[PDB]
C-alpha cells in the first residue's frame, strides 16, 4: 500500500512569507496526486489535482509541482486565510492513500499562561464529586507542560487535559487541566497546586489554594 | 455540483452504521465514481471505498470484511454501510466525487463531512457548576472565571456568558470523554473592579436533552 509521508508535521508562519509542504510516496505515482486543505474546525476541499492542476477558485498564490515520489505544494504570499491542514492523496493505485497532514498555524511573539486554579463547587461536593480546575491561558508557543501537586507530591491519574486550536483573531493557545477526585479522597488532603511549564520562564508559575 | 451526507450520529458498538450521500447538480449513473473516505479523530484520513457510475464497487481491503458501498439510482443517492463497528470506527465520514478512467483528468472533490460516534451511552443532561476563584487568591485588574460541564452525552454543548454580551476573553474548552460521557469547561475574563460588582453568568445549551441551565459565578466567601 502507497505509503505517503509528509512535511513538515507543523510550522508556524508569517503573513507575505513563502511556504513549502512537501508529499513522499513510497513508488512513483505519476502525479496521480492531489492536495487537499482543511480550514480549521472546516471540511475538506481540493485545491490541487494531478500534482499541479489548480481547481478554479482556488487562489493563485497556490501551486503544486513534482514527479515520480517527490511533489510539493508552495504558497506564494501566506494569507489568513491559509492557515489550516493541508493533506496530499495518491490516486494511482487502490486503496487510494493520504499524507498524515501538515499543519499551517500563524506566527507571533512569545506569551507567558495566565493560569488560575478552580477549587470544587459547593454544589459538586453536595453531589460527592471533586473536580479542581486549572487554566492555562493564552500562552504562545503551543508548546505548555502542567503538573498537579496534592501537599507537596505529584499526581498523575486521575488527570484530563483539553487544548484549544490557535486563536484565529489573537494566534494565542489555551489549556484547561482538570482533576476529578471524589469527595471523600479529595477530603483528606489540604493543599492543591497546579504547575505550568513554558519556554517563557525558566521556573514555573504555580497556582494554590488550601481547603483552609 | 453539491454531495450532502446524511445519517445517524451514534451508532452502537458491534452494529452496523449507515450513511447516505444525495448528490445534486449531477448524475450518479452518469460518469465518475462515488467514493466514501473518513477523518479519525487525531485527523488522520483514510479512503474506505468507491461504486462507480456503472455500479462497480472497490474496497480498501483494511474495511474488505465490514463494507458494502450500494446505491438508488431514483434518488441519485449512495449509501455506506459499515458492520460489526467499534470505537476506533468513531470518525468524520465524508462522500465525493473522482474521475474513474485516468484520461479525462478529473479533480477529486468531497462533501461535507458528518460525525458518527460509537457508543453504547444513554443521553444524559449536563450538571452544571461554577468557577470562581479560592477567597481571595492574589487580584489584579482582571480576574477570570470558568463553569464545569460534567457528565454529559452526546455533544454538543454550547455555553455563553451573560447571553451574548460577553463576547471578548472568552474560550470554551473542547470537550473530553471522562467515563463514557463528555466534560469541558469555558473560561471567561473581565475587570476585576466589573466582578463581583456586575453579576457574570453563563448559559449552557444541550439540545440533545432539550436542557438549558444559568449559573451565576459567585464569589466564594
Known amino acids: 500500500q502507497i505509503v505517503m509521508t509528509q512535511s513538515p508535521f507543523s510550522m508556524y508562519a508569517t503573513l507575505g512569507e513563502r511556504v513549502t509542504i512537501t508529499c513522499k510516496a513510497s513508488?512513483?505515482?505519476?502525479?496521480?496526486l492531489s492536495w487537499l486543505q482543511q480550514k480549521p474546525g472546516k471540511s475538506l476541499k481540493t485545491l490541487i489535482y494531478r500534482a499541479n492542476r489548480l481547481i478554479t477558485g482556488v487562489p493563485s498564490r497556490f501551486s503544486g509541482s513534482g514527479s515520480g515520489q517527490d511533489y510539493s505544494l508552495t504558497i506564494s504570499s501566506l494569507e489568513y486565510e491559509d492557515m489550516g491542514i493541508y493533506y496530499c492523496?495518491?490516486?494511482?493505485?487502490?486503496?487510494?492513500?493520504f499524507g498524515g497532514g501538515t499543519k499551517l498555524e500563524m506566527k507571533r511573539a512569545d506569551a507567558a499562561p495566565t493560569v488560575s486554579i478552580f477549587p470544587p463547587s459547593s454544589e459538586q461536593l453536595t453531589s460527592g464529586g471533586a473536580s479542581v480546575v486549572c487554566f492555562l491561558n493564552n500562552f504562545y508557543p503551543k508548546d505548555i507542560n502542567v503538573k498537579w501537586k496534592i501537599d507537596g507530591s505529584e499526581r498523575q491519574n486521575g488527570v484530563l487535559n483539553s487544548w484549544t486550536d490557535q486563536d484565529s483573531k489573537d494566534s494565542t493557545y489555551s489549556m484547561s487541566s482538570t482533576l476529578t477526585l471524589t469527595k471523600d479522597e479529595y477530603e483528606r488532603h489540604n493543599s492543591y497546586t497546579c504547575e505550568a511549564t513554558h519556554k517563557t520562564s525558566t521556573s514555573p508559575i504555580v497556582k494554590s489554594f488550601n481547603r483552609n | 455540483v453539491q454531495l450532502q451526507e446524511s445519517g445517524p450520529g451514534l451508532v452502537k458498538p458491534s452494529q452496523s452504521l449507515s450513511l447516505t450521500c444525495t448528490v445534486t447538480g449531477y448524475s450518479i449513473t452518469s460518469d465518475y465514481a462515488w467514493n466514501w473516505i473518513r477523518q479519525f479523530p487525531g485527523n488522520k484520513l483514510e479512503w474506505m471505498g468507491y461504486i462507480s457510475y456503472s455500479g462497480t464497487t472497490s474496497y480498501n481491503p483494511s474495511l474488505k470484511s465490514r463494507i458494502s458501498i450500494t446505491r438508488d439510482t431514483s434518488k441519485n443517492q449512495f449509501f455506506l454501510q459499515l458492520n460489526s463497528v467499534t470505537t476506533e470506527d468513531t470518525a468524520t465520514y465524508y462522500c465525493?466525487?473522482?474521475?474513474?478512467?485516468?484520461?479525462?483528468?478529473?479533480?477529486?472533490?468531497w462533501g461535507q463531512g458528518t460525525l458518527v460516534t460509537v457508543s453504547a451511552a444513554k443521553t444524559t443532561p449536563p450538571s452544571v457548576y461554577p468557577l470562581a476563584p479560592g477567597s481571595a487568591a492574589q487580584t489584579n485588574s482582571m480576574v477570570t472565571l470558568g463553569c464545569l460541564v460534567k457528565g454529559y452525552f452526546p455533544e454538543p454543548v454550547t455555553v455563553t456568558w451573560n447571553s451574548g454580551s460577553l463576547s471578548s476573553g472568552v474560550h470554551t474548552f473542547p470537550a473530553v470523554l471522562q467515563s463514557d460521557l463528555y466534560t469541558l469547561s469555558s473560561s471567561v475574563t473581565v475587570p476585576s473592579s466589573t466582578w463581583p460588582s456586575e453579576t457574570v453568568t453563563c448559559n449552557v445549551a444541550h439540545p440533545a436533552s432539550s436542557t438549558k441551565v444559568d449559573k451565576k459565578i459567585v464569589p466564594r466567601d
Open positions: 492523496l495518491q490516486y494511482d493505485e487502490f486503496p487510494y492513500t
Open positions: 465525493g466525487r473522482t474521475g474513474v478512467y485516468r484520461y479525462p483528468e478529473r479533480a477529486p472533490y
Open positions: 513508488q512513483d505515482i505519476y502525479s496521480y
